[PDB]
């Protein structure tokens, strides 16, 4: 029971965008990678604000009236506004489509980047289950789990204990 990011998201992760789930003797639970969530929240907020705040426009006017014998000039004004309508509409559609695809890729990269940091810490003291979870080859008490999430897990500390558990599997 309890799988990782390969199979989808977690309804139980409520205090952040990215996080971890653990299980050892002392229990289980969810915990958000607070700092990774911080760094991505700034990036998404900046992207939306840039798309919004960069629209610095000249004063808009509604004076577009010409006299009765100048309908051709009125048509020129009509097609000028048609041209800008087509330009802004097309650019706005593809801006949103392109950025939405990139925003989802941005979250995927952040999730993958937590997965790589844990993978390189555990090295071969754990077995990658392929579903975003790791099978610790040693007892990992609550202090051990916190060290993994803080990036301070020691490979050589549990290295002997993991080696004996691995040769049993072999």
């Amino acid at each position: 029971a309890i799988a990782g990011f390969i199979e989808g998201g977690w309804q139980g992760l409520i205090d952040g965008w990215y996080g971890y789930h653990h299980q050892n003797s002392e229990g289980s639970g969810y915990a958000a990678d607070k700092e990774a969530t911080q760094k991505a929240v700034d990036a998404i907020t900046t992207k939306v604000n840039n798309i919004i705040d960069k629209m610095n426009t000249q004063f808009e006017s509604t004076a577009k009236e010409f006299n009765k014998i100048e309908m051709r000039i009125k048509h020129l004004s009509d097609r000028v506004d048609d041209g800008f309508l087509d330009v802004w509409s097309y650019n706005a559609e593809l801006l949103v489509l392109l950025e939405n695809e990139r925003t989802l890729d941005f979250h995927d990269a952040n999730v993958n980047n937590l997965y790589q940091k844990v993978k390189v810490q555990l090295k071969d003291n754990a077995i990658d289950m392929g579903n975003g979870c790791f099978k610790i080859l040693h007892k990992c008490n609550n202090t051990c789990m916190d060290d993994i999430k803080n990036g301070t897990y020691n490979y050589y500390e549990y290295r002997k204990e993991s080696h004996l558990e691995k040769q049993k599997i072999d």
Epitope: I14, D15, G16, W17, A31, Q38, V41
Partner: antibody, heavy 124, light 107 residues
């Protein structure tokens, strides 16, 4: 409708113990982390402790470490601060504060959008 | 510990003035700054979060700006109900820290 209510403060001799209570209503109390922030008379705001939504993780300022314990009751929607070995420098008005959520996630590290009236603890 | 240095410790102004209060951090806190307004005997009120975002129900005369180390809270046109003490708070990492505070008072 959404507001907290602190209680349990009073006059207390040095070295004694108190437990503060923060009764929450109007919001999903068990989704937010919570914080205690105290203010000495005439001085600024000092953060003392915080706890995650599920109570699994707890953070303390150095000034109250080993003496204060934060905790919460999900069924009572109440937050607690157990204060041991009280000192005159612990004298302050104690607030419980809710960190703001953003993008729909209840991040514990944020600004504090909800505060109670506070409860007064005088150590002398 | 990240320390926030608020300037000035106090200032006097009249109604309709423009008031600037700055908050300086020892290290980069990106955008995790908050501003609070506190009247005597009352709890603090959240005015600005994200170092610029206006909190729901707060007048548009309060604005905040800054990123990383230096932040500024501006009251464009003072009102009678704006005479209080103002605090900046960081939300970058534990422990949460506040600025020394700034009292805005009548001349």
């Amino acid at each position: 409708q959404v507001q907290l209510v602190e209680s349990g403060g009073g006059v207390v001799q040095p070295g004694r113990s108190l437990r503060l209570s923060c009764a929450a209503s109007g919001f999903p109390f068990s989704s937010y982390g919570m914080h205690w922030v105290r203010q000495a008379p005439g001085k600024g705001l000092e953060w003392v402790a915080g706890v995650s939504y599920d109570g699994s993780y707890k953070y303390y300022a150095d000034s109250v470490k080993g003496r204060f314990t934060i905790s919460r009751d999900s069924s009572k929607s109440t937050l607690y601060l157990q204060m041991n070995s009280l000192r005159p420098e612990d004298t302050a008005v104690y607030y419980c504060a809710r960190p703001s959520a953003i993008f729909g996630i209840y991040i514990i590290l944020n600004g504090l959008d909800v505060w109670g009236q506070g409860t007064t603890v005088t150590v002398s | 510990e990240i320390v926030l240095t608020q300037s000035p410790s106090s200032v006097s102004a009249s109604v309709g003035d423009r008031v600037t209060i700055t908050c300086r951090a020892t290290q980069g806190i990106s955008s995790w700054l908050a501003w609070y307004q506190q009247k005597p005997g009352k709890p603090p009120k959240l005015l600005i979060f994200g170092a610029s975002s206006l909190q729901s129900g707060v007048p548009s005369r309060f604005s905040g700006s800054g990123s990383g180390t230096d932040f500024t809270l501006t009251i464009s046109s003072l009102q009678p109900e704006d005479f209080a003490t103002y605090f900046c708070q960081q939300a970058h990492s534990f422990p949460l820290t506040f600025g020394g505070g700034t009292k805005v008072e009548i001349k």
